[PDB]
Design an enzyme around this catalytic site. Structure first.
Site, PDB file in Angstrom:
ATOM      1  N   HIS A  77       7.515  30.406  63.515  1.00  0.00           N
ATOM      2  CA  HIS A  77       7.994  29.677  64.473  1.00  0.00           C
ATOM      3  C   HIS A  77       6.749  28.944  65.529  1.00  0.00           C
ATOM      4  O   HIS A  77       6.902  27.164  65.669  1.00  0.00           O
ATOM      5  CB  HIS A  77       9.064  29.686  65.631  1.00  0.00           C
ATOM      6  CG  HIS A  77      10.240  29.772  64.899  1.00  0.00           C
ATOM      7  ND1 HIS A  77      11.461  30.363  65.851  1.00  0.00           N
ATOM      8  CD2 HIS A  77      10.594  29.914  63.569  1.00  0.00           C
ATOM      9  CE1 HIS A  77      12.507  30.531  65.132  1.00  0.00           C
ATOM     10  NE2 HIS A  77      11.978  30.163  62.743  1.00  0.00           N
ATOM     11  N   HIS A 244      12.080  36.514  53.682  1.00  0.00           N
ATOM     12  CA  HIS A 244      13.025  36.089  54.641  1.00  0.00           C
ATOM     13  C   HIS A 244      13.512  38.048  53.793  1.00  0.00           C
ATOM     14  O   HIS A 244      14.486  38.320  53.564  1.00  0.00           O
ATOM     15  CB  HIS A 244      14.774  35.847  54.091  1.00  0.00           C
ATOM     16  CG  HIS A 244      14.749  34.908  55.097  1.00  0.00           C
ATOM     17  ND1 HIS A 244      15.673  33.128  55.288  1.00  0.00           N
ATOM     18  CD2 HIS A 244      13.586  34.346  56.488  1.00  0.00           C
ATOM     19  CE1 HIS A 244      15.261  33.102  56.421  1.00  0.00           C
ATOM     20  NE2 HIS A 244      14.851  33.786  57.135  1.00  0.00           N
TER      21      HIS A 244
HETATM   22  C1  HEM Z   1      15.345  27.150  55.911  1.00  0.00           C
HETATM   23  C2  HEM Z   1      14.613  27.237  56.453  1.00  0.00           C
HETATM   24  C3  HEM Z   1      14.681  28.726  57.422  1.00  0.00           C
HETATM   25  C4  HEM Z   1      16.001  29.393  58.241  1.00  0.00           C
HETATM   26  C5  HEM Z   1      17.272  28.317  57.751  1.00  0.00           C
HETATM   27  C6  HEM Z   1      15.646  30.348  58.587  1.00  0.00           C
HETATM   28  C7  HEM Z   1      16.933  31.095  59.388  1.00  0.00           C
HETATM   29  C8  HEM Z   1      16.095  32.330  60.245  1.00  0.00           C
HETATM   30  C9  HEM Z   1      17.924  32.682  61.387  1.00  0.00           C
HETATM   31  C10 HEM Z   1      18.573  31.774  61.094  1.00  0.00           C
HETATM   32  C11 HEM Z   1      17.441  33.640  61.584  1.00  0.00           C
HETATM   33  C12 HEM Z   1      17.410  33.908  62.445  1.00  0.00           C
HETATM   34  C13 HEM Z   1      17.247  34.507  63.855  1.00  0.00           C
HETATM   35  C14 HEM Z   1      17.547  35.773  64.857  1.00  0.00           C
HETATM   36  O1  HEM Z   1      18.962  35.791  64.992  1.00  0.00           O
HETATM   37  O2  HEM Z   1      16.703  37.000  64.715  1.00  0.00           O
HETATM   38  C15 HEM Z   1      15.880  33.848  60.624  1.00  0.00           C
HETATM   39  C16 HEM Z   1      14.970  35.014  60.577  1.00  0.00           C
HETATM   40  C17 HEM Z   1      13.961  35.806  59.761  1.00  0.00           C
HETATM   41  N1  HEM Z   1      13.248  34.119  59.127  1.00  0.00           N
HETATM   42 FE1  HEM Z   1      13.550  32.480  58.665  1.00  0.00          FE
HETATM   43  N2  HEM Z   1      15.104  30.386  58.189  1.00  0.00           N
HETATM   44  C18 HEM Z   1      13.690  29.474  57.284  1.00  0.00           C
HETATM   45  C19 HEM Z   1      12.278  30.193  57.120  1.00  0.00           C
HETATM   46  C20 HEM Z   1      11.614  31.505  57.247  1.00  0.00           C
HETATM   47  C21 HEM Z   1      10.394  31.033  57.001  1.00  0.00           C
HETATM   48  C22 HEM Z   1      10.278  29.722  56.452  1.00  0.00           C
HETATM   49  C23 HEM Z   1       9.367  32.260  57.293  1.00  0.00           C
HETATM   50  C24 HEM Z   1       8.259  32.888  57.221  1.00  0.00           C
HETATM   51  C25 HEM Z   1       7.799  32.482  55.921  1.00  0.00           C
HETATM   52  C26 HEM Z   1      10.636  33.392  58.088  1.00  0.00           C
HETATM   53  C27 HEM Z   1      10.859  34.266  58.457  1.00  0.00           C
HETATM   54  C28 HEM Z   1      11.711  34.257  58.949  1.00  0.00           C
HETATM   55  C29 HEM Z   1      11.848  36.606  59.362  1.00  0.00           C
HETATM   56  C30 HEM Z   1      10.452  37.323  59.060  1.00  0.00           C
HETATM   57  C31 HEM Z   1      13.095  36.853  60.181  1.00  0.00           C
HETATM   58  C32 HEM Z   1      13.611  38.215  60.554  1.00  0.00           C
HETATM   59  C33 HEM Z   1      13.167  37.819  62.075  1.00  0.00           C
HETATM   60  C34 HEM Z   1      13.560  39.276  62.773  1.00  0.00           C
HETATM   61  O3  HEM Z   1      13.717  40.778  62.031  1.00  0.00           O
HETATM   62  O4  HEM Z   1      14.036  39.377  63.616  1.00  0.00           O
HETATM   63  N3  HEM Z   1      11.979  32.345  58.027  1.00  0.00           N
HETATM   64  N4  HEM Z   1      15.297  33.342  60.228  1.00  0.00           N
END
Ligand code: HEM
Ligand code: HEM
Ligand SMILES: NNC(=O)c1ccncc1
Ligand SMILES: NNC(=O)c1ccncc1
Ligand SMILES: [Cl-]
Ligand SMILES: [Cl-]
Ligand code: NA
Ligand code: NA
Lengths: 713, 713
Positions: A77, A244
Site C-alpha cells: 500500500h 496473495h
Molecule cells: C487487484 C489487486 C489487489 C486487490 C483487489 C487486493 C485486495 C486485498 C484485500 C481486500 C485484502 C484484505 C484486507 C484485510 O481485510 O485485511 C488484501 C490482503 C493482502 N494483500 Fe492484496 N490485493 C491486491 C493486490 C495485492 C498486491 C499487489 C500485493 C503485494 C504484492 C498484495 C498483498 C496482500 C497481502 C500480503 C495481504 C494479506 C494481509 C494480512 O495478512 O493482513 N495484494 N488484499
C-alpha cells in the site's frame, strides 16, 4: 472559522508550492539523510525486523503467530498509491503516515502495522526513515517467509507534512461510480491522473467493479489501474498472486462494528483508528476490509499454492460474515489453517479479483505459465516487487546501502557511467563562445535547454536533461518540443560537439546532454548581454548520453508536457483552467511561487514560447533578459479583454486610444490578477529590480538545469 | 478536488505556524526592510503623494478633484481591522492587499485606491513597503487638506501571503446577527476575539445595529467595537468626527449594479473588483457602500463643519438611492457641494452612526466640548490617528525615519532608556551562581521567566519580558502567573539584585527585567546538569524596568493568558478545543510546530505547569531536562481514556495490568494523536535524540526570552 478557500473555492492554491519549508522540518538545516543512512547497521535493523515478525502484541495479535502478511500489505500500500500520469503517490516520501492516506479505507489497520514498528524506528532514530522502514519491513517479511527478494535501496528521506495531491472529487469514501463527482466517463474511462477506481482504494474493488462480482469485468479494472501504476500484465499477475501467497483478509463480522478512521478518531486513540466493537475487536475477530479469505495452506510460507488452488478448484460465489462478495472452493476439504485456533481448518477461498487471474484470457496464459513454472513466478514477483517499491526513487545514484541490485533495469531510465575527464571552466567558456558563434539564437538555445531539462518531476524524480533523451524517440517528436526546429538545433550542437571532442587529448570529451545545457546557459548569458548586463550562468558538467535501446518509449509517454505554462503551451482544451496547470507544473518542478514568477517572466522575453507565439511577450526587445514582462503587465495604462474568437486569449489595449498593445493567455494574465502572484510581479516590476530580476532568473534557471543531478548530491 | 480539510474539517491546522517561510518570500534571506527604508528619500515620496492627490485618473475619477477622502478611508481601513483580544489585524503587515481583506465589502473600491499608488510603489521599490505606503498616504491626504499630523513612523515590513486570522464563522458576507453562526449571544455580547458587528465590516454598520437606524443603540456597538480596537470614548469621537470631516460616501444607485469583489472577478479585471453597471460605474455614479452622504461644506479641507452640522440641525430619516437608511438636515439650504457638478448643491446629511456622537449621552458631552473647543478636537484627532495607525507596530525601537514623534505615549507600553553600563559575561556567571545558591528551584526559575517572556505576541508586538511588568499590576496578579509563588521568587531576585547593584562601581547595574530572564537561564542550565548535560544558555542583557505609571493596567488586561498550553493552563471551559488554543498561542509566539513541540515537552519536565499539576509530567525525574515527555507519551505499553469526572482529562494505564501511570490533558495528548505532531514527537522520542532535544530546547527557550528585543534588532 470561514477561510479564503470557503469564500473563493475556485481560486488557485499557491500553498502547494510552499510545503516542505525549513519551518515544518524538525531536523536541522544541515541534516543529510543519505549520510545518516550510510552509517546505519542495515543488517542489525533486519535482524530486529525478523524477530518482530513472530513477536505478537496483544493489542493486535498476529495472524498465525506471524505479522509477515500484514507487513507485506503495508509495504504494497505504501508503494501502491503511485500514478504514472504525474508521478505522485508511491512509497518514496513515507506519506502513508500522514493524512489522507493514513485514513483511507484501503489502509485500515495499517495504523496497527506502523505502530508495531515504532520500537525499531525509535531504536535507530534518524538513520532510518519511516519511508525506508516501510519498504524494508516488507522485504524482511518476504525473506523471513522463504522468498528471495531482488534487492533493496535506502535513501527515501522522511517528509513532515501531507503532500497536496488530487485523489479525485468525490465527497464520500468509496463512492460507487456514476455520482455527481464520478471519476468515470464514456465507456468506463478513468479520468487522468487517477489510478484507482473508487476514492480511498489503492487500485480496484476486491468484490468487482462497483461491487459487481464478475471476475472478467474486474480484470478490466485491474489491467487499467495497474497500467496507470506502471505495471504490465506479467508484472500485475506476478504481484497479485505473489502478494496473495501470504496472510489473509479480515471480515469476521459486520462493518458497522468498525469506528472512526484515524484522522476522525478521538485523541485518546493516540493516532490509531478503526476501533471495532465486534467481540474482541482484533485477532480472530478482526475486521479490516470486510472479506474473509485465506488463500493458501501455508499463509506464513512462500509456496506455489495460490495457483495450485486457483486452477485446482472450481469456485462458488458466497458472502463473508460482513456481507461482502467472495468465493469458496466447490467440494473442497478443510485444508486451510485457521489464524488462531489450531483445531480449525477452512476451505480455500478467493477474491473476485483473484479469479480475474484465471478468467481473463490474457491473464490466464500468464497464470498458467507461472503455475507450471513457479521459478518463473518467483523471479517475476521479485523483479516486480523491487520495481513497485522503488518506482519513485529516481535515478540509481540516489540508491543507498549494501543491497542495491547491480542489474540495471530499463524502467530506471538508465544513464551510462562517465569514464572520461570532464570539461573545465575554460572549456565551458570556449564551448559557450562556439555555440554563440554558430548563429543559434537566444530563443533557440533557451527553448532547447528548457525542453530538455523541464521534463523533470520531483514527484517520482523522473525526467530532466541528464541522458540527452530529447534527441531520442519519443521526446524529439513531442509537439511542445517543436520537432523541426529542435532537429536543426541538435544538428548544429552535435557538429560543435564532434569538433570539440575531436580536438581533445587525454580522453576529455563533452556529452551532448551537457552541451545542450551549456548552450542554454550561453543563451541566457547572451540575453543578459543584450540587455547591457555581464553575467556568468553557473554550469555543472557530468551528464551522460543514453541510447535509444536504454529508453523505454512507452514509459516516456507520461512525461510528455501537454500543458507547459512556461512555454505558453496547451496541447488541447482541458477542464482544469490553464493557471491551475501552471501551478501544478511548478510544483512538479519543485518551484516556489517567487521562482515560478521570475522564471516565467524571463522565459517570455527570451523567446521560449512554442511556435513563436506573441502571447505574453510583453517587450519590444525580445531576446534581451529584462523585467519587461512585469513592468508591462502591471501598467494600468493597458486595459484587458477576452477575445470574441477565444475567451482564453486576451487583448491588452491602450486605455486612452484603444490601440492594440499586446495579447496574453490566462497563464500570462494570472500574474496581474491573483493577489499573491501580483504581489510577486510588483517586486520584479519595480524600478529598483533589474539586477534582482537577472540574478534571481539565473538562479532558477540553473536550479532547473540541475534538477536531476543526484550525481552531484 | 477533495482535501484533508474537507474530510476532517475539525482537525487542527498546523499550516498557520508555517506561513511566512522563506519559500513564499520573494526577497532574499538577508533582506532587511529597515535598512532599505532608512535610505528612502521620504520627502521625495511625500512630494509624489501630494501630486497624486489631485491627479485624477479616468478609470476612477477623483471626487471634488481630490482623492484625499478616499485615501483617508483606505488608511483607516488598513488600521481598522485591529483587535486588542489577539493583536491580529491592523496596518502593520499591509494585509489589505491580500484575501480576504482586499475583498471585504467594507473595503469596496479601496482596490482603486491601492492601484492609484502603484506608480509610486514601483518608483521607490523595496525601500517603501506597501504597509508603510498605505499609512503614509493617509497622512499625506490629511496634510494636503490642511490637517497637521502628529507624526509618522516607517518600518512595517511587507508580508507575502494572507495571514490565518479568525474573522468569524459566518458563511454569508454581512450576515445579520442571530444566524446559525452568530457572533453575538446573550445581551448583544460579541464573541472574543472579534471586533466587528458583521462579517466583512470594519467596526459597525453605518445604518445602525443589524440595519436598524437607532443612533443610541448604534452608539453601543460603536463603543464596544472601538474598545475592542483599543480606543476609548474621546479617541472614538475624535476619530469618527475627524474622519467624517472629509470626503463622501457613494450610493448613487442600487447595489445590485455592483459585480464581483476582487477575489471573485474575472482575470481580465487584473486584480480590481466591484465593477458597476450603474451609468458610468464610477465618479458621479459611484457605488461603494450604498449610502449617499457628504458631511461638510468643504469636503477637501479640514474644517470644524462636522460638529456645526451635527448640532446645528435636526435630522430626519431618509433613504439613499440604493435604499439604505441615512439622515437629512430638516429645513436646511443646499450648502454641501457636489463632487462633480458645480451647478449642484445638497442638504447636509449624516449616517446613523454619526448621530450616535450626539445622541449617546457620554459621546454628546465629548462632541460638545470638541464643537466648543476645536483646537481640542484637532489635537485629539491627531493623537488618535497616530495611535490608530501605529497601534500594532510594537516597541518604539521599531519606529523608523525622520517623522517619529519624540513624545512617549502610554499606549506604547514604554520602556525607559538604559543609561548605565550593562552586566558582562563574568557578572552573568556571578548572578546565576547567586540565583542557584539562593534555594530557588528549577521549577520556580523556569516558570517565572516563562511567565515574564511569554506575554509577547508577534501580531501587534506587545508583551515580553522587557520592562519587568510581571512585577506590576495586573501581571503580578494573573492566575496563570501563580501570584503567591511569583511574589516569593520576585522577593528573592530583588534581594539579589539589590545586593549586586550595591556592590558595583561605575554606574553598572542589572535591571530586574534582565535578572528574571537570567535566573530562568540558570534554571535551564541547572536542569540540564541534573540530567548529566553540560549546557550554557545564551543571555542578552539590556532590558529595563518600566514603572507602574508607564503600564496602563486596562490595556494590559488583553495580554492575560486565559489559555496557555505551555503551562497546561486553561482559565475556563471554552468552545474552542484546547489544542486549537495551543496552536493559536504558538502562532502568537512566532513558533513553528517543531519549536512548539520541543518547548512544550521540555517545559512539562521542568515543572512549568500552573499549580504543579501532574498532567503531562511524563517523567520520574522532574526538574531534569530530558526528552522523557516524548519517550513516555509514545510508549504503546500505555493505553489512554478520558475520565468519567472530566472528558478533557485522560488517564494513561499499563495495557497489561491496568495500573494508572499518568494523567494528561488534550494539550498533552494531541502530540500523540495529530499525525503531524506525532511525527515530530517521534523525532524527539528516539534513542539518538537526547542531545538534539536539549539543544533545540535551549534554542527555542532563548528565542522566547528575546522576542521583544527590538533594541538588539
Ligand atoms: C487487484 C489487486 C489487489 C486487490 C483487489 C487486493 C485486495 C486485498 C484485500 C481486500 C485484502 C484484505 C484486507 C484485510 O481485510 O485485511 C488484501 C490482503 C493482502 N494483500 Fe492484496 N490485493 C491486491 C493486490 C495485492 C498486491 C499487489 C500485493 C503485494 C504484492 C498484495 C498483498 C496482500 C497481502 C500480503 C495481504 C494479506 C494481509 C494480512 O495478512 O493482513 N495484494 N488484499
Ligand atoms: C463608526 C465608525 C464609522 C463608520 C460606520 C463609518 C462609515 C463610513 C461609510 C459608510 C463610508 C462610506 C463608504 C463609501 O460608500 O464610499 C465612510 C467614508 C469615510 N470614512 Fe468613515 N466610518 C467610520 C469611522 C471612520 C473613521 C475612524 C475614519 C477616519 C479617521 C473614517 C474616515 C472616512 C472617510 C475619510 C471617508 C470618505 C471616503 C471618500 O471620500 O471616498 N471613518 N465612512
Ligand atoms: N505531490 N508531490 C509532488 O508533486 C512533488 C513531490 C516532490 N517534489 C516535487 C513535486
Ligand atoms: N495573524 N497573525 C499573527 O498571529 C502573528 C503575526 C506575526 N507574528 C506572530 C503572530
Ligand atoms: Cl505525493
Ligand atoms: Cl493579521
Ligand atoms: Na511520488
Ligand atoms: Na496585528
Amino acid at each position: 472559522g470561514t477561510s479564503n478557500r470557503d469564500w473563493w473555492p475556485n481560486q488557485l492554491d499557491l500553498s502547494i508550492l510552499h510545503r516542505h519549508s525549513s519551518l515544518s522540518d524538525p531536523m536541522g538545516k544541515d541534516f543529510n539523510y543519505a549520510q545518516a543512512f550510510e552509517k546505519l547497521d542495515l543488517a542489525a535493523v533486519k535482524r530486529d525486523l525478523h524477530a518482530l515478525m513472530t513477536t505478537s502484541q496483544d493489542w493486535w495479535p498476529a495472524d498465525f503467530g506471524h505479522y509477515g502478511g500484514l507487513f507485506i500489505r503495508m509495504a504494497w500500500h505504501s508503494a501502491g498509491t503511485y500514478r504514472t500520469a504525474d508521478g505522485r503517490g508511491g512509497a518514496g516520501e513515507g506519506q502513508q503516515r500522514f493524512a489522507p492516506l493514513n485514513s483511507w479505507p484501503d489502509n485500515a489497520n495499517l495504523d496497527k502495522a506502523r505502530r508495531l514498528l515504532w520500537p525499531i524506528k525509535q531504536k535507530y532514530g534518524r538513520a532510518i526513515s519511516w519511508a525506508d522502514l516501510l519498504i524494508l519491513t516488507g522485504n524482511v517479511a518476504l525473506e523471513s517467509m522463504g522468498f528471495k527478494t531482488f534487492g533493496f535501496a535506502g535513501g527515501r528521506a522522511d517528509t513532515w507534512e501531507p503532500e497536496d495531491v488530487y485523489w479525485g472529487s468525490e465527497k464520500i469514501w468509496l463512492e460507487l461510480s456514476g455520482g455527481p463527482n464520478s471519476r468515470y466517463s464514456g465507456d468506463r474511462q478513468l479520468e487522468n491522473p487517477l489510478a484507482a477506481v473508487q476514492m480511498g482504494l489503492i487500485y480496484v474493488n476486491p468484490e468487482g467493479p462497483d461491487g459487481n462480482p464478475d471476475p472478467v469485468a474486474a480484470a478490466r479494472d485491474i489491467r487499467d489501474t495497474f497500467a496507470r501504476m506502471a505495471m504490465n500484465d506479467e508484472e500485475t499477475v506476478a504481484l497479485i498472486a505473489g502478494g496473495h501467497t501470504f496472510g489473509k483478509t479480515h471480515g469476521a463480522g459486520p462493518a458497522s462494528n468498525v469506528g472512526a478512521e484515524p484522522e476522525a478518531a478521538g485523541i485518546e486513540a493516540q493516532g490509531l483508528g478503526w476501533k471495532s466493537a465486534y467481540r474482541t475487536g482484533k485477532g480472530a475477530d478482526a475486521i479490516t476490509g470486510g472479506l474473509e479469505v485465506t488463500w493458501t495452506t501455508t499463509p506464513t510460507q512462500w509456496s506455489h499454492n495460490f495457483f495450485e488452488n486457483l486452477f485446482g478448484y472450481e469456485w462458488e460465489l458466497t458472502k463473508s460474515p460482513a456481507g461482502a462478495h467472495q468465493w469458496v472452493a466447490k467440494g473442497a476439504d478443510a485444508v486451510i489453517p485457521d489464524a488462531f485456533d489450531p483445531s480449525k481448518k477452512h476451505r480455500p477461498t478467493m477474491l473476485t479479483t483473484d479469479l480475474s487471474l484465471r478468467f481473463d484470457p490474457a491473464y490466464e496464459k500468464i497464470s498458467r505459465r507461472f503455475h507450471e513454472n513457479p521459478e518463473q513466478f518467483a523471479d517475476a514477483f521479485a523483479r516486480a516487487w523491487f520495481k513497485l517499491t522503488h518506482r519513485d526513487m529516481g535515478p540509481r545514484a540516489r540508491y543507498l546501502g549494501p543491497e542495491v541490485p547491480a542489474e540495471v533495469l530499463l524502467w530506471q531510465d538508465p544513464i551510462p557511467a562517465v569514464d572520461h575527464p570532464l570539461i573545465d571552466a575554460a572549456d565551458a567558456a570556449e564551448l559557450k563562445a562556439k555555440v554563440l558563434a554558430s548563429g543559434l539564437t537566444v530563443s533557440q538555445l533557451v527553448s532547447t535547454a528548457w525542453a530538455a531539462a523541464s521534463t523533470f518531476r520531483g514527484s517520482d524524480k523522473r525526467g530532466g536533461a541528464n541522458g540527452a533523451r530529447i534527441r531520442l524517440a519519443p521526446q524529439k517528436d513531442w509537439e511542445a518540443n517543436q520537432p523541426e526546429q529542435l532537429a536543426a538545433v541538435l544538428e548544429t550542437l552535435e557538429a560543435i560537439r564532434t569538433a570539440f571532442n575531436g580536438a581533445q587529448r587525454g580522453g576529455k570529451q563533452v556529452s551532448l546532454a551537457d552541451l545542450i545545457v551549456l548552450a542554454g546557459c550561453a543563451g541566457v548569458e547572451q540575453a543578459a548581454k543584450n540587455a547591457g548586463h555581464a553575467v556568468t550562468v553557473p554550469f555543472a558538467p557530468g551528464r551522460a548520453d543514453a541510447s535509444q535501446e536504454q529508453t523505454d518509449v512507452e514509459s516516456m509517454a507520461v512525461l510528455e508536457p501537454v500543458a507547459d505554462g512556461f512555454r505558453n503551451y496547451l496541447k488541447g482544451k482541458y477542464r482544469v483552467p490553464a493557471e491551475v496547470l501552471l501551478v501544478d507544473k511548478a510544483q512538479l518542478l519543485t518551484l516556489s511561487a517567487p521562482e515560478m514568477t521570475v522564471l516565467l517572466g524571463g522565459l517570455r522575453v527570451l523567446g521560449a514560447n512554442v511556435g513563436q507565439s506573441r502571447h505574453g511577450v510583453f517587450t519590444a526587445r525580445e531576446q534581451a533578459l529584462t523585467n519587461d514582462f512585469f513592468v508591462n503587465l502591471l501598467d494600468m495604462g493597458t486595459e484587458w479583454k477576452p477575445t470574441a474568437a477565444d475567451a482564453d486569449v486576451f487583448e491588452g489595449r491602450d486605455r486612452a486610444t484603444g490601440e492594440l498593445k499586446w495579447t496574453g493567455t490566462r497563464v500570462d494574465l494570472v500574474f496581474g490578477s491573483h493577489s499573491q502572484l501580483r504581489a510577486l510581479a510588483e517586486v520584479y516590476g519595480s524600478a529598483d529590480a533589474q539586477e534582482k530580476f537577472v540574478r534571481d532568473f539565473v538562479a532558477v534557471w540553473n536550479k532547473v538545469m540541475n534538477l536531476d543531478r543526484f550525481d552531484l548530491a
